[PDB]
Structure 1
Amino acid sequence: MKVQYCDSLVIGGGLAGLRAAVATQQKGLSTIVLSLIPVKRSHSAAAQGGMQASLGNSKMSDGDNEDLHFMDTVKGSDWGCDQKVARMFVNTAPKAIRELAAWGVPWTRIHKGDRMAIINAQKTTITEEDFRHGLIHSRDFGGTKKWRTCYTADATGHTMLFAVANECLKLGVSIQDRKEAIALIHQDGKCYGAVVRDLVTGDIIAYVAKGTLIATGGYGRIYKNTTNAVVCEGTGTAIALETGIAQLGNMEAVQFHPTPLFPSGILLTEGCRGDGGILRDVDGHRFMPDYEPEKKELASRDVVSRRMIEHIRKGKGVQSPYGQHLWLDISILGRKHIETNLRDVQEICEYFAGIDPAEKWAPVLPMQHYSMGGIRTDYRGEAKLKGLFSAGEAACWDMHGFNRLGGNSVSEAVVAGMIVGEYFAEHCANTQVDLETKTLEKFVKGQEAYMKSLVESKGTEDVFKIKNRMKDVMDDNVGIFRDGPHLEKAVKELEELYKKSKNVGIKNKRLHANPELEEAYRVPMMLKVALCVAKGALDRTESRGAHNREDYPKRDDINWLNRTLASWPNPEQTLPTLEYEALDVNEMEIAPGYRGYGAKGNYIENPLSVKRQEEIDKIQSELEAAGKDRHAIQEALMPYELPAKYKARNERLGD
């Protein structure tokens, strides 16, 4: 038997998974980092827009602060997130972005002088003072009433992933690409590590360690049309669910992006609009402050996208041999504001769309892009399976709720990595474990058998036909607009397939570097993660954030101010066991109301919502008359907990 130990494993060398391993390895904990493909090729690299931090340097980031970011985030969450987490976060992003910039990351910085902004209408000539020259700059982004989205051109995610990964290499972390986690190791509801299958040699190894973190990124690939890389299949989400002890949260909360270059699905940044570029209809105008006057563009995903399907369902979808769609005209947004800062989102258009960006509008169309849900964990990172932590799009720490805010995911990545890191190092350095050879063997010898059955399998299902059929079902019925009948013909076929996925037959017998065998043990997992979303969504009868239910269009606060905690307790069962967890209004620093946009007055209101509001304004006004700063009041309304290292307040420009 092959076994390898380390003080702290880290399943997923993404952007978040790496930051975490940095905060552990930097303090004696010998750590490992498994990964399908070499780290610097993760999906983070493909980050366009930027990182959002309540910084406040730019003439626009000006006057920004935790509170504003806090609110911007919370209101965007359509109130389905954990307020004290969103709080920990905001107070860390700033000092997170600074660390990065000090590690190399070249953030496009401010220059003394007058700019040439485009705003919504047109050119407005902005002027940055001179006490701002050389400080991290910002961009206007989706749903922000302040410019706090930082950037390094439009390939921001890239310069970050590298700056971090490079750091691990400096510390002696151990990267081990082409190695996949296929099952976690638990004994008495405790995680001892994982069972890994060397994608190349093909042999199973047991990776044991005191702690174990899972950062396997989104699951956008359970859908046919997604912007996510082809290795964002949620296998990692799947294996924590297969332990039947931990639970996935809001698995049905899937965010969709408005302008992914159709049909490839290759992203085309929001900096398009935040930089002034705007959406042209089929008639070719602005269904912009036409459908929603506070700008259609510069509104949340679930918003800006919704109507993008309305105009089309009214038959106004000017298709092609693949489908109806719209266009994004940034032709009028200068050839300097395009040939730079929308540099990729221009080459992307020439090499694929075979046309020019500073020329025309693109054949776009909303598709899946982010995955809020995932392994549900508490505020410190740990889950229900004590010992197993999580962070990144991969899990549901939930500072997102039912609608992530543009430029937050890759801020949550480093932030969460910093926070959940300190709490992971703590656990591994203290918790003592009882490693049992009988158990280790049970899991390993048990996984090996699994591989064999698959090879000696005699069933006759084309995993590629079952796989592709799943992605069809999802993208169709669980699209932007969901309804009772369709989230049933789905929850049904998705099940009928998890049953067919056990009768598959592969042609290539080899037990090594076999790609076919990979898609055989990978699919069944995806389906189980698919059932969690489809069924998870079917049950949740109302319309909140990215969850639009044509038949329960009102954001029910009285019944659905909870989180769909999906589990899979028994090995046999074909459908997830959805239990719900309620939210406490008397812990919210901001009570349930209108989100600043979206359709007005469409939420069946809850009584405690108001009551809490009153006593918020009570406390508010009293401590303002008393002469208390915003931190004192924050502390009043709702206190949040943070680790030592990241306690101090973020010093801003002009105090």
Structure 2
Amino acid sequence: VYRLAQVSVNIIDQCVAQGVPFAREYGGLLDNRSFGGAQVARTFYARGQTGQQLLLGAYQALSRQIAAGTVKMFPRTEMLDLVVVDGRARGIITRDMVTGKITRYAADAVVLATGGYGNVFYLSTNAKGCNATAIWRAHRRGAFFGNPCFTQIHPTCIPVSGEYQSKLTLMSESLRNDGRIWVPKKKGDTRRPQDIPESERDYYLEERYPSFGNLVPRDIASRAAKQVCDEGRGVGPGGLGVYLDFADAIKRLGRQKIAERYGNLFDMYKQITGEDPYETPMRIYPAVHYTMGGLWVDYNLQSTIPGLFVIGEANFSDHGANRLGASALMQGLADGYFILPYTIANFLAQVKPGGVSIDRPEFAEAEAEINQRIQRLLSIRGKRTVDSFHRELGKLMWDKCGMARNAAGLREALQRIPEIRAEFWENVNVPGEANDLNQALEKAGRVADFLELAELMCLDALHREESCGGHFREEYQTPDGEALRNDEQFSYVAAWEFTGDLAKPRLHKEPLVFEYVKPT
């Protein structure tokens, strides 16, 4: 954490030098803004697409290196396995997503920067293609999963219009600083939300939770929202949603200033939903946003497997049990720019370059495993689609291993996950051929990895008999609803080892000592 905070300044210097169009003041110097709940203005931003400009700067540097010949880019190519030779991660097995070709690449070092696994819950704010295939293959090859149950959610997300949708668009969570969360008191209300009188509006998070008034933490508010939607309200197209109303704010504050604060958000919401939030209440619903978990890495960003380095959201690293705002971009840029170039050099200087080619038996075994898996997936020809299984898995994980977790629910999920996995491997329909642009095959492989990863997620959530950050257990909570840590018995990082049995991974505790920031 100190290394990340120390190199953030170099991150900003590098981003400015690369031409990232950060916001500027009228005097020519950089402009800072404050996040939600932050007491300092330490955030540098583009207008509303800071991540886009940061990734564009990184992509321009990558394009410069590709033109220089130092970097070989392989877009539309998905790594399907990790080749570990003589105990070191000595290559990968990939599939071309256009021609279907299985290729073997050998290297002296392997870096996994494949992002988080927030799509194990089917409904999430992540991109459609986000998966955990690379990190799960590495975990099966010897890498340890550090706290796989650590998942962050976003409180304000545009809900889904039906079972077809799998992506919840992320709206800014400052929208709760100027809106009121409610649902109609009657379970079935055909009236327009603006026509519903104030006395007939169940203004929960205000009737309940009088403390933290109008600034309830995202976890408590979102757990209340999910409980309300699970009780059955029918407010959304499928009943999954809550009215974040802006009517009283528009009456109180100037509509011009409310526009100046939330114009882009209201325009995007009106585009997605077709409803103007200036007249009708907006609808929001929680969705899983981030995964602070991932492969355990040491101070050198190296996993349990020598030569395998995990950076970004794919490792556990610096976020603990809850990722602060603007820290995932900071962590990714720090790992890429100012940490991994040192630690990978440290690893490589102690080993001999070359010596491993793609004709080794390990590459052949990994390629045969990948080909057999692909052929089996294509040959099942079941009656169910891949997205059906992914939806079932995500619904079970969101109900049982979501924002509210308990021992009975986690045990039920641990019973159900193998059943869903068996039903997938016996009754899934993956049409098309392997040597073709088969998107259903990509989805099938990703869901096949997700079905195994979710069991480990539930096992880790069951093991951690405490509440910390995003991980919440109902048995361990303060009367106010906050997380209740057990620092005496659970002050460690849980790294899980693949033992060949999916239901019995081996737990390795990495003790946590705090010499500077004392736990409280």
Shared fold, TM over 0.5: yes
Number of the residue aligned with 1:322: 238
Contact 1:296–1:303 under 8 Å retained in 2 = no
In 1, the alpha carbon distance for the partners of 2:327 and 2:379 equals: 46
TM-score (normalised: structure 2)? 0.84
Residues 240-287 of structure 1, C-alpha deviation per residue, up to 9 Å, x if partnerless?
1121x11111111111111112236211113446xx634444448794
Distance 2:280 2:378 in 1: 51
Q: Provide the secondary structure at the position in 1 that maps to 2:407.
A: coil
Report the Cα distance in structure 1 between the residues aligned to 2:518 and 2:373, rounded to whole angstroms: 50
Alignment match, 1:48: none
Whether 1:400 aligns to 2:324 is: no
Q: Which residue of 1 aligns with 2:335?
A: 416
* Equivalent residue pairs, number: 478
**Any idea what SS the aligned residue of 1:378 has?**
coil
TM alignment of 1:197-236, pairs within 5 A: 197-236=95-134
Q: Deviations for 1:478-506, whole angstroms, at most 9, x for unmatched residues?
A: 12111111111111111122233332453
Per-residue CA distance 1:168-200 (angstroms, 9 max, x = gap):
111223322110000000023210110000011
Q: CA deviation at 1:358?
A: 5.4
What are structure 1's unaligned runs of at least 5 residues? 1-85, 112-132, 594-655
Instruction: Give the conservation status (yes or no) of the 8 Å contact 1:180–1:196.
Output: yes
Aligned letter for 2:171?
Answer: L
Helix, strand or coil at the partner of 2:301: coil
Q: 529-538 vs 167-176, which deviates more?
A: 167-176
Inter-partner Cα distance in structure 2 for 1:576 and 1:455: 29
Return 5+ residue gaps in structure 2 as ranges: 161-166, 184-200, 478-483
- 1:519 maps to which of 443, 458, 461: 443
> Is the CA contact (8 Å cut-off) linking 2:145 and 2:295 kept in structure 1?
yes
Q: Which amino acid aligns with 1:157?
A: G
* Cα distance, 1:164 vs structure 2: 1.4
Q: AA paired with 2:300?
A: R
Shift of 1:439: 2.7
For residues 155-304 of structure 1, what are the structure 2 equivalents within 5 Å? 155-172=49-66, 173-243=71-141, 245-263=142-160, 265-272=168-175, 277-282=178-183, 283=201, 287=205, 291=209, 297=215, 301-304=218-221
Specify the alignment match of 2:164 in structure 1: none
Give the secondary structure class of the aligned counterpart of 1:181.
strand
**Change beyond 3 A, Cα 1:238–1:343:** farther
In structure 2, what is the Cα distance between the partners aligned to 1:294 and 1:539? 30
Q: Which of the numbers 142, 146, 165 marks the counterpart of 2:40?
A: 146
Range with bigger deviation, 485-494 or 344-353: 344-353
SS at structure 2 position matched to 1:474: helix
Q: Give, as a single letter, the amino acid of the residue that structure 2 aligns with 1:142.
A: G
Q: In 2, distance between residues paired with 1:138 and 1:165?
A: 24
Pair 1:314–1:249, CA change in 2 (3 A):
closer
Match of 1:500 in 2: 423
- Aligned: 1:365 with 2:293: no
Amino acid at match of 1:528: E
User: Could you tell me whether the CA contact under 8 Å between 1:142 and 1:405 is conserved in 2?
Assistant: no
The DSSP-based 3-state class of the residue aligned with 1:566 is: strand
What is the TM-score of this pair, normalised by structure 1? Answer: 0.67
- Counterpart Cα distance in 2 of 1:171 and 1:550: 50
Alpha-carbon deviations, 1:65-84, whole Å to 9, x = none?
A: xxxxxxxxxxxxxxxxxxxx
Higher-helix-fraction structure: 2
2-side partners of 1:250 and 1:197: how far apart?
29
Counterpart secondary structure, 2:111? strand
Deviation at 1:456, TM superposition (A): 4.0
* Equivalent pair of 1:277/1:333 in contact (CA under 8 Å): no
Looking at structure 1, the residues matched to 229 and 381 of structure 2 have their Cα atoms a distance apart, in angstroms, of: 45
Q: Supply the distance in 1 between the matched residues of 2:214 and 2:90 (Cα, whole angstroms).
A: 49
Deviation of the 1:229 alpha carbon: 1.0
Equivalent position amino acid for 1:87 in 2 = Y
Tell me the alpha carbon deviations over residues 129-181 of structure 1, each in whole angstroms, 9 at most, x when there is no partner: xxxx4332222213312122221112211111112101111122332211000
Aligned amino acid, residue 558 of structure 1: E
**What is the SS of the residue equivalent to 2:242?**
coil
* AA in 1 matched with 2:244: W
Query: SS state of the match for residue 33, structure 2?
Result: coil
Instruction: Show the counterpart of 1:529.
Output: 453
Residues 328-359 of structure 1: CA distance to partner in whole angstroms, max 9, x if unpaired? 53757766766667554233212112133455
Q: How far does residue 288 in structure 1 lie from its aligned partner after superposition? A: 6.9
Identity across aligned pairs (percent)? 27
Residue 540 of structure 1 deviates from its aligned partner by: 1.4
1:104 deviates by 1.0
Change (3 A) 1:424 1:322: same
CA distance in 1, matches of 2:441, 2:204: 49
For 1:647, the equivalent position in structure 2 comes to: none
Matches of 1:303 and 1:459, distance apart in 2: 41
